Amino acid sequence: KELVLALYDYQEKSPREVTMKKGDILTLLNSTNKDWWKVEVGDRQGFVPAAYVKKL
């Protein structure tokens, strides 16, 4: 529903994670966890650290 901004480059470390580039605009899918948010990066879905993204 919401959009988030990738504040840093982040390379996924596990299958459930996804990679993002600084400045990417991600779709926020699930932010119920305080440390890991599920996002859509382009056509991929996965988790990134909440600390590395900013809600828009």
Q: List residues binding Na ion (CB under 5 A).
A: 12, 15, 17, 50
Distances (CA, A) of 15 to 10, 12, 19, 26: 14, 8, 10, 18
Closest by alpha carbon to 44, among 22, 24, 18? 18
Q: Quick one: 1 or 15, whose CB is closer to Na ion?
A: 15
Least gap, CB of 24 to Na ion (angstroms):
14
Least gap, CB of 40 to Na ion (angstroms):
13
Least gap, CB of 51 to Na ion (angstroms):
5
